[PDB]
DNA sequence: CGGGTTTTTGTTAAGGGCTGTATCACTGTG
DNA sequence: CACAGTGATGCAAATCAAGTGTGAAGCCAGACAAAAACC
DNA sequence: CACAGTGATACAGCCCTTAACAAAAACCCG
DNA sequence: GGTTTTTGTCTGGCTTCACACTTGATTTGCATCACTGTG
């Protein structure tokens, strides 16, 4: 420090001599300058922006709130990020990240169970306390030796407190629409809300050891996501809001997580029970929610479309899955349907169901057992989940390319010419279907059928590589036209607005399925003469009807509950308590604080 | 910026040509003491700690090695980090985090390529390039229509340089282990290095869509450790780095992986031939690699340990 | 009210170097 | 006797906010005066 | 038309030097 | 020995950081708990 000064000494002098006759006399700021100028010539603008911050006021420092967001949106484990943070802590000095406890101190505001709220008319069978959190899925159930059996293990949040605390996290972006609506700020108007319900049942979930009952190797998730958000304004009503991504893993939110068979119907009604029971106390009452200081009144529109078909015939009444009665959507017989092809109606409904299976118990007319289901259209139980008739797009996507592989496996042996084939001879063309499909769009061979195989194999050259192993040019023909209108037929029940993007496939869609169904009738007797798939009479009868009842179909599908499903083996392996009993309360909860969208908008900083 | 530059015109031009008189022309640094000096005669000594750790890269920064660790260490992907790096710039200004490409830069070192190596002999069969990567693991198999069918995916290192990268992984540790049992620092005795190659195959492995081979869905793994490096001093020997968790997952270094069938002999004969051929070349055979400023040479021992019952039975002549 | 003076900011083109983003064929939960 | 997690809980250790008067340290002024590596 | 990755690679953007000139904003005084 | 560099000091005056005491009031660190995953 001092041996430096008698290269200096002559500088000096100059310097703030300079500094006095043209600056003013600071001499610490105009070397500032200079050093500046300097390190941006060099190219050192990281050094550069680092001597102005430290100049400036130091912005050192991140909030516990945008830590907690990066350590949920970058899939990150509290280990993993209490290391990273010790080592930044370790080498750089000051603290720029922020502690574990500070960081599960912040997330609280986002979980259920923090902020008040109240109910204008006093929800019937549920308490109106404002201070519930996780509570147990059992709903406190009899687990006495002397009882029916338990085996579920369910951990759960209110259903209300969820909602509220969806809401609230939602309040920044209720505001941002509402002024981009170029409407008030301040206006508290009756908010309709309309949310989506979603549930599936998956399997091959590894059963852990420990203390607890014999829970089986299966799970169900029950989750909502919010889709559109309205208000009134004189004669009509603003959207407020509207879900980007509908179908993506960042708006499903985890509600009931229960490790339970999907079809055993006694523990599955068990634990769905309040849920229902809620849905109903909620159906016809008022929500009173402060909103940035200002009280904002809330409605709530239930509509339940995230339903598979085996889930939907287990819960609406239908008889197993299979029966004679093939949609949940019309009372048509599977031969009835196999003729006509085209003309239909939805007539279904829960209250419907209902009243059927109050008639198929009491049988008032003293009727048989087959004129009695043929009076009730096939409802031998009673329903406990309201669903509205809707068509699951990835599971009939699904379907159709199955079906589609079977009938490009029989063309490619010419079953049309030989109606008896033996299964040395089926296990061929299947072998050989296998070979050339990798050989040309290389798709490897696969057990059950995947959504991407669907997508792929859903293509022109497709029927040219099946084309190209089948001797005769009729069937080439036959194919290659069926294949064009399927493809006119997807959009319309794939995308998200059929009404903006697809007009003239919209309008072309009931032609398109006059031209299908007739080909099958014509071209396919030996496939579709006495039966059709459920798949293909969902496509064929009731789409447009949906399509003009609904507003989208595929924006209500099950994409994001399957991308939820993704996530929830991930949590379960990394983000989770590794023990029977607090496992499933950890993944509700770091689930939750994903799907916010409070912590989402912190990683888009950069487009600010 | 302009009308910076445009006021202080002259300053920079006597400032240079006195540092092309008394230094030489490094604007930088005579720019850098300048401030310093004026901070001092302004009494601030915690901000002139602060800014010589900044340009030392210390008091912020987080040199791309160290990110590069948080990023492996902290299982986090390359997009994830992307991710994080980018919404850390935004919210706090700096660059806490080191960009992707600099990571990149960083990441060459540690890979094998990068080091000169010599042999003494020259291995038989083995190049003596040294700047060998990841080479494809059928070594040239042919895989023309008219001979054996190939269907199996390998990529896989170069024995020697694969040994050559763990050993200057370790350059650190290996000096501190000799500085241990007081011996000297710059000692070039024979190292005898211990290595531990274990072999074992997978099942249910997805094979994936894509060109390539009708590949099955089982994967082979060859990997090795290093188990202990020993001196010769005087007439006994001393060892200077033993491993304290030879069973962790952080030392089962990988050699060569191959998407193949383990039941399969042919095509693990094919890929895994030329791993024996260097095993065998190196086994009487001096490293020399330049350890810090000294350089020492190096020995080899192989022990293959880590084979489950069926794969030695189906390797070294026994049935079933 | 407007020249006149002084100061602020940008512009033209040839090269070098760091930083950011699009592109490629795929993944998974079904 | 595999080993790196897996996250919530709880107690112990560390740091600090409140009050003003000290000490202790670094540096400024321009100038004078000894050690040390190449001829 | 599912949607968020997944990583290596290459091209575009932004910014620094040279130096002379040009467009534009703030006071002074006849 | 010459030459240049590198440290050392000189006293009065200035600023700048640490602490001397006490009592709480937080924030932060790390061990514990029964488990997983790859065979
Ligand atoms: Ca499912
Ligand atoms: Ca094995
Ligand atoms: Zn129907």
Known sequence: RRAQKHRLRELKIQVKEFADKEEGGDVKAVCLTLFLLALRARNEHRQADELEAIMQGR??????????????????????????YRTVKAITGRQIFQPLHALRNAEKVLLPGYHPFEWQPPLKNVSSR???????????????VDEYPVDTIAKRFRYDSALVSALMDMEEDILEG??????????????????????????????????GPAVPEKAVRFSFTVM?????????????????????????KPLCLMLADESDH????????????????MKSSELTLEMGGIPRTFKFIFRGTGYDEKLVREVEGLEASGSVYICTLCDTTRLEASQNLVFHSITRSHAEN?????????????????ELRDRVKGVSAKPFIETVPSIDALHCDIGNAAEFYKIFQLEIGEVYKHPNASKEERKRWQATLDKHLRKRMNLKPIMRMNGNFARKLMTQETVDAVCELIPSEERHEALRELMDLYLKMKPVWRSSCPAKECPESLCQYSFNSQRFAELLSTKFKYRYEGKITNYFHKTLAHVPEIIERDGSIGAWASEGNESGNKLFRRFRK??????????????????????????????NAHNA
């Not at 404002?130 to 006495?144: F, H, P, Y």
């Not at 229902?276 to 106390?281: L, N």
Request: glycine residues 6%; negative net charge; charged residues 25%.
């Open 59 to 84: 912005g050192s420092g991140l909030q516990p709130a945008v830590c907690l967001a990066i350590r949920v949106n970058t899939f990150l484990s509290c280990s993993q990020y209490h290391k990273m």
């Open 130 to 144: 404002t201070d519930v959190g996780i509570i147990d899925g059992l709903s406190g159930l009899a687990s006495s």
């Open 178 to 211: 509402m002024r981009s609506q170029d409407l008030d700020d301040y206006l508290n108007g009756p908010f309709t809300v309309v949310v989506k319900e979603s549930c599936d049942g998956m399997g091959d979930v590894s059963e852990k050891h420990g203390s």
């Open 228 to 252: 559109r958000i309205t208000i009134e304004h004189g004669s009509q009503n603003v959207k407020v809001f509207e879900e980007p991504k509908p179908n993506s893993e960042l708006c499903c």
């Open 266 to 281: 006694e523990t599955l009604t068990a634990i769905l029970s309040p849920l229902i029971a809620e849905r109903e106390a």
């Open 354 to 370: 209902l009243q059927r299976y109050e008639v198929w118990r009491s049988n008032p007319y003293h009727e048989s057992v087959e």
């Open 574 to 603: 990394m983000n989770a308590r590794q023990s029977k009993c607090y496992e499933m309360e950890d993944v509700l909860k770091h689930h939750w604080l994903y799907t916010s969208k409070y912590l989402q908008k912190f990683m």
